[PDB]
Amino acid sequence: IDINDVTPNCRVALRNDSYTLHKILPNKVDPLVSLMMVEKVPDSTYEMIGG
Amino acid sequence: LMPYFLLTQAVRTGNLAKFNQVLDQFGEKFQADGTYTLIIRLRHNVIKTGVRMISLSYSRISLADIAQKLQLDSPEDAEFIVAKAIRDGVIEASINHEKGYVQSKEMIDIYSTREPQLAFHQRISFCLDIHNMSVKAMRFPP
Amino acid sequence: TRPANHRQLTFEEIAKSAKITVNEVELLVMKALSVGLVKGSIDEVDKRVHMTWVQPRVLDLQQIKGMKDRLEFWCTDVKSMEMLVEHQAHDILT
Amino acid sequence: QAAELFLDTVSTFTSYELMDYKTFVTYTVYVSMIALERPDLREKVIKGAEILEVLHSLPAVRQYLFSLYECRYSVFFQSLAVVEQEMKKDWLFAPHYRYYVREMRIHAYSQLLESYRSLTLGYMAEAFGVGVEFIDQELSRFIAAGRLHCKIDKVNEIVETNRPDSKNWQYQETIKKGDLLLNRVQKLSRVINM
Amino acid sequence: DHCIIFMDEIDALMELLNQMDGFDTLHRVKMIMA
Amino acid sequence: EFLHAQEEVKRIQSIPLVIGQFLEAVDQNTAIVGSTTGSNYYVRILSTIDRELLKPNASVALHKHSNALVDVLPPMLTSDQKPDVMYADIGGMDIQKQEVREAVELPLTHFELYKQIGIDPPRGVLMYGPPGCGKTMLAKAVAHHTTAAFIRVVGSEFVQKYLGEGPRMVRDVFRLAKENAPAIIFIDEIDAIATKRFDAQTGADREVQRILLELLNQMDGFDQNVNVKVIMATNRADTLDPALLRPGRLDRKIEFPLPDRRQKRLIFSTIT
Amino acid sequence: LLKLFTTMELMRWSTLVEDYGMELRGSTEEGEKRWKDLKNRVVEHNIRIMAKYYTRITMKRMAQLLDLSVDESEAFLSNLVVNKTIFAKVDRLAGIINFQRPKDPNNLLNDWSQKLNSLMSLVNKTTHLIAKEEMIHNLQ
Amino acid sequence: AVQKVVVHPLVLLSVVDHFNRIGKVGNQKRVVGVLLGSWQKKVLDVSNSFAVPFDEDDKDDSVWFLDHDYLENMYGMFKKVNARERIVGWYHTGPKLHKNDIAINELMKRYCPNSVLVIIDVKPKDLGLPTEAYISVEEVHDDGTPTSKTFEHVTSEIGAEEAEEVGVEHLLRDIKDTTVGTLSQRITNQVHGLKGLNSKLLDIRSYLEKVATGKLPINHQIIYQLQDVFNLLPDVSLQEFVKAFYLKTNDQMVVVYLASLIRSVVALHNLINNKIANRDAEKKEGQ
Amino acid sequence: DDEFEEFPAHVWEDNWDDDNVEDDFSNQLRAELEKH
Amino acid sequence: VIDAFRLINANMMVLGHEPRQTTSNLGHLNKPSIQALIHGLNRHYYSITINYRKNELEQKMLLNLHKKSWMEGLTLQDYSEHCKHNESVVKEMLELAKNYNKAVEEEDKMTQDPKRHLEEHVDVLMTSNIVQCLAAMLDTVVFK
Amino acid sequence: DKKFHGILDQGEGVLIIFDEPPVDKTYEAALETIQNMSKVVDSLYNKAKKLT
Amino acid sequence: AHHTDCTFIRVSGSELVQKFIGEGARMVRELFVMAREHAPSIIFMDEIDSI
Ligand SMILES: Nc1ncnc2c1ncn2[C@@H]1O[C@H](COP(=O)(O)OP(=O)(O)O)[C@@H](O)[C@H]1O
Ligand SMILES: [Mg+2]
Known about the structure:
Chain H: GO terms for molecular function: protein homodimerization activity. Chain H: One of its GO terms (cellular component) is nucleus. Chain F is α/β, with parallel strands linked by helices and 272 residues long. Chain F is built from 9 helices and 9 strands. In chain F, 32% of the residues lie in helices and 15% in strands. The longest helix of chain F has 15 residues. Chain I has 36 residues and is mainly α.
C-alpha cells in the first residue's frame, strides 16, 4: 500500500508479529453515530404526500 | 374414438342389445382399424366386467344374488362364471357352495407387508438408474 | 429348556407338568415371579405365560453339550450371513 | 369456485339485476353444501349472519341445510328431491341436477359412514327413510364408481367400512404422485440424454 | 431464603425504581416497614 | 481427503474459544473484532459463520490464537416475570378491553383482518381515568394474554437525573421494543414528562421537554416501527402535548371512568 | 399383616378375614366403614399385583381374585382408571381386561435393540472370562 | 475392588518399546514393568509405566528376580517428575499368564494393595484390545470347591488425554479412517461386526466343547453368563414384531425413495446445464 | 420430432354417471316412501 | 507444533560462510514461521526437519485407541432418535426444495446454495436410512 | 365432529375406542417435497427443451 | 431519502445530548466528518429545538 493513502486519523492494521502495517481498514469512529447512516431506504414515496 | 364411446357405454351397462346395435352400426370402422375379434372377446369380457364390478363392491354376495345383478340364469351358471372369473384372476375372491356364497378376501392392511418394500424398490431402482444415465452423457467437448 | 422361539408356556402344559389343576397355575407363576426366579407376564385370556427370563442355575455336562450344539447352529447362521454380505458388497468395502 | 365467490360476496349482494337476494342465498346454500367440508360449512353457512337470516324467510332450504348438518337424513333426502325438482326447472342449474343430486347423496352416505365400521343395512335404511333394496342398489353403484369407502355383505346384510388409515392413505398418495413425477422425469431424461 | 423484614429509615429521595413492587413470595414471612 | 479437510475445518471451530464483540465487516472473508480482553484485532472469519447474522456490534467467539471469529453467540431486562392477572380477573370495562385488544393483540394474532380493510394497525393507545379504576391491571392482563413481550416503564424512570439520561432510556426502551419483533411498550405515568409547549427558560424544563421530544421521535420518525406497540396511562389526559396526543401515528384514546353500578357489581363478583 | 401388605403377591380377602379377622377385637363401630376401607385397600393391592403380573385378565377370573362381583369389580376398576391409578382398558364385550399399554413400534424395536446390545456385551464378557479360564487351567 | 481400567496410548507404546529394546539384545519372551496411574471412584486410569529388571527360569517356573530396589528408586524419580501418579500395579508382555504371576502380584501388593496386572500383548491382533487386566482374589468359594489364589478379570479400555490425542492423531494421519460415516465405511463396519461375532461364538463353542469332553473344569460363572445370553436371545417369528419391522422398514425406504427422486432431478438439471453450456460453446465456435 | 405419418389421422370434466335412471332422486324416493 | 534447532557459530555467518550447506533439495520443502523469524530463526540457530519414525506395531497399538468394537459395528440406532432425525432432515430438505424451485425458475427466466444443500442432505438421509435398515436385517438373521 | 377417537359398530352393537397414532409428519413433508420437485422438473422442461 | 442518490443520515431527537461533557460537540463534529467522507449527503435533524 502506498504511503499517500495512510492519511492521519485512519484505521490501519499492524501485523501481530513485527507490527508492520498491512492494510487501510475502513476508517470509522464513534459507533454511537456510525450506526446512524441510513441503510434501509424508507418506504414512503412522493405519491404518498398531497397538498 | 366415438364408436368406442358407444361400445364402452354398452359394456359398462351390460346391455347386449345396445352392444349389438353398436356393432351393426360401426362395424366397418372396427374392421378398418383392426379390432373385430377383440370386440367379440369383448362379449366374453363384458360378462366378466359385470362380475368384476359386483366383486369390487361386495364382500359376501350370495350366488342367487349374483344371478341377477350379473344377468344370469341360475346359481349353477353363477358358480361356473364366477369360478372362471377367479381362475382368470380378475375378482380375487374365494367361494363356498355349502351354503352358497362367494366371500371375498378380507383385505389385509398393506403396510405391515412387503408390498411397500417392493413398490419403493422398483421406484428407487428407477431413480438411481436415471441418476446414472444423467451423470453419464455429460460429455465435455475437448 | 424351551428356546425363545416358542417360550410361550401354556397353562395345560404347566398342569401336565408339576401336578396342579389349572386354577392355581396362576398362583404358581405369581409366586415364581415374586420370588425373582422367572420374569415375564401372564396372558390368561388365551391361557398362556410369556416367560422372558429364568434364574440361571448350575447345569450338568449333558446340558452344556446341548448349549454347545445350539452355539454350533448359531455360528453356522452367522457365518452364512457373513459370507453373503461380504460377497454381495465386495466393491464398497474400504 | 362458485362457493368461494358466493360466500365471499354474500354480505355484499348488490347485483339485483341477475336475481333476487332470496335466490342468491339459496344458490349460496346449494353450492356450499356440495362444495364445502363440514367444518367450513358450519363456520360459514350455518353460523353465517345473512345466510341464516334469509333462511327464516326460506323454510324449505333451511330444512335442507340443517338436516344434513344435524345428521337428520330422511329429511335430507326429502329436501334433496325438492331441490332436484327445483333445479331441473332452473335455467342455470338445469344441466347440473343429476350431478348435484348424486354428489349430495354421496356426501350424505359418506357423512353417515364416517362414524361407523359396520352399519346394519336395515338401520341405515331406516335412518335414510328408504328401503333395503334401494340402499343396496345405490351403495353398489357408488362403491363401484369409487366415491365411497364401504363394502356390502348381503348374506347377513351388513355394510362394513374399509376406510384407510392415515399412514396407508399417505402411502397411496405417495405412490400416485411419485408415479406422475417419475413419468415426467423419465420423459425428460429419455428425451434430453440422447 | 433467610421472618420479619425491616425496611427502616424511609425518610431521607431522588430514586424511582424503589417503588412498592410487592412481589409474591412463599406464604408466611412478613414485613414491618416503618 | 476432502472429508478429512472438512473435518479439519469443523475442528477449527473449537470449544475453548474466547468471546468478543465483532465490530465491522472490513471486506470479503475478513473483519475487525474487539475481544473481551479490551483490545481490537483484525482477522479472517471462517467460511460460512452466518455472515447474515454477523452484524456489526455482534457477540462472537474467537479462536484463542489468530483471534479468528468462528462463532456467533446468540445473545433480558423486562418481560420475563410472567404476569398473573387475567381477563377473567378484570371485571367490566368490556369497552376498554375491546379497544386495548384491537390496538395491542389482534395486530399480532390476526393481521390478515387488517390487510383486508387496508389499514395501518394503531400502534399506540392512551388510557384516561381517575386515580384508580383499572388500567394498570388491563395492561397487565394484555401482558397475560400476550405473545410478544410487555416492557413496562414509569415516566419517573425517564425523569431520572442527569441530562440526556431520560432520552437515553426512552431510546433504549424503544430499541428493545423493535429488536423484539411484536413487543409492547407500556408507560405508566406520563404526566411527568408529557407536558404542553412551555418555553423552558431554565435548564430543567428544557430537559423535560427534551424527554418528550425524544419520545415523539421514537414513536414516529424516520425509523417507522416494525410491529411494535405502545400503551400509556396518564391520569390527567388534558395537559399532554398536542404532539404526543397527535390523533394520528402517535395515539388512540380510551376512557376508564369511575365504576358505574354495573361495573361495581362486576367488581364485587370478581373479587369476592 | 404388614408382611402381606408389603409382599408382591396376591392376598385373598376371604382368607385374610379368616386368618387375621379376629385381630379387630381401629375396626369398631364406624370401624365398619373403616372395614370397607380395608377391603378397598385389599382390592386395590390385588389390582396393583395383577397389573404388574398380568396382561389380559378375564373379568370372570378377576372377580374371583378380588372376591367382588362381576360388576363391582368393573366399577372399582373404572374408578381407579378415571382417577388415573391403574392403567386398564376393559373390553366389556368379551371380558378381556387389558393392562398392556399400546405398544408403539418404536418402543418394541427399541426393546429388541436393547436385548441385542446386552447380548453382545454379555458374550464379550463371557469370551474374556473364557480366555482367563483357559489361560489359567492350561498352565497347570 | 476396581471395575474399569483405562489404559493410555503412552503406556501401550512404552510397553512396545520395552519389549523391542530387550528382544533386540536378547531373547527373554516376557518383559515386566510397573504401571503408574490415578484413581477416580472405582476407575483406574493407567497413565504411565516403566520397565523393572526381570529374569526367570522358564523350566522351574518359581525362580524369578523382579528387582524391588530398582522399582523403589525408579518410582522415586517419577514421583519427583510427576506426583499425582502412584504405583497401581504391573504389566508383562506375555501372551498368556505364568505360574509366577501370583507371586509377582504378591510382591507388587507391597507397593499397591489394589494391584492390576495388565497383560499388554505386543503382537497386533485384529479383533480385540491389546490390554487384558486382572486382579488377585482369595475368597471362600460359595460352591465349596477348594480355594486357591487366582486372578479375576477387570474390564479394560483404551482412552487418552487430549495431550495424547494430539499425538496419536498426528502419527496416524497418514493411514487414518475418516471420522464420518461414508456408506462404504459403514457397510465395512457391519461386516467387521459380523467377523467379530463369529470369532466370539467360535471361542465360546471351543470352550464348551472342552468343558463337555472334560479337558477343563466347569466354571459356574461362565455357564451362568452363557445361559443368560441364551435367555436374552430374541424372537423374530412373533407377529407383532414382523408387523413393526415391516412398518419401519417401509418408512425408512420412503425417505430413501424421496432422496433418490431428489437426486435424479438434480442430476437431470446438471445434465441440462452442461448440454446448454456445450451448445453455446459450439454455436460461438461456429460463429 | 417426427410426425408418425405412417399412421393416418361442454367444458365440464365429466366422469360417467350419464346413465338412464327413473329420474335421479325424485320418482325413486316417491316410490320408496310409497312402498314404505 | 514441534521444531528442532541448533546454533550457528559466531565465526560462521561473520566469516563469509552460509550457516549450513545444501546438497539436496530436501531442506527447502518446509517453510519457516514468522514467529521464529522475528526471534532469529536464521541468525543464531538452524531449523532441522523432524520426519517422525513410525514402526508397523506402534501404529496398530495406537489405532486401538479409537478402534470401534464389533458391537459398535453391529448395533442399531435408537429408533426414536432415528425417526426424529429423518423428520427434521426431510423438513429442512423441503424448505431447500422450495428455495430450489424458486431459484431454477428465476435463473431460467433472467437468463448454487439450494442445490448443494439439497445434495448434502440427500446424502445424509440415504446413508443413515440404508445403514440402519441393513443393520436391522443383519441382526434379524444373525440372532435367530 | 371429532370429539374422541372412536368408531361405532352396528353389528354386535359395540362402540370401539382407540388411540389414533399421530400423522407421521415425515410423509407429509415428503409429499410436499414431491410436489415441489414436480414444479422443478416442469421448470427444467422449460429451460432444457426451449434452449436446446 | 427514498428518492435521493446521496448518503441520507438521521440525527433526529435528543441524540446529541449525552451526559458526559465534551461529548455532544465531538459527536456533531464526527457526524459531519462522516457526511464529508460520504459526500454527497443529506443530514436530517428532527426536532432541532431539542438539540
Ligand atoms: N375492574 C376491576 N376488577 C378488580 N379489581 C380492580 C378493578 N379495577 C381496579 N381494581 C383494583 O385496583 C387496583 C389496581 O388499580 P390501578 O389499575 O393501578 O389504578 P391506577 O393505575 O389508575 O392507579 C388493583 O389492586 C385492583 O384490585
Ligand atoms: Mg398502575
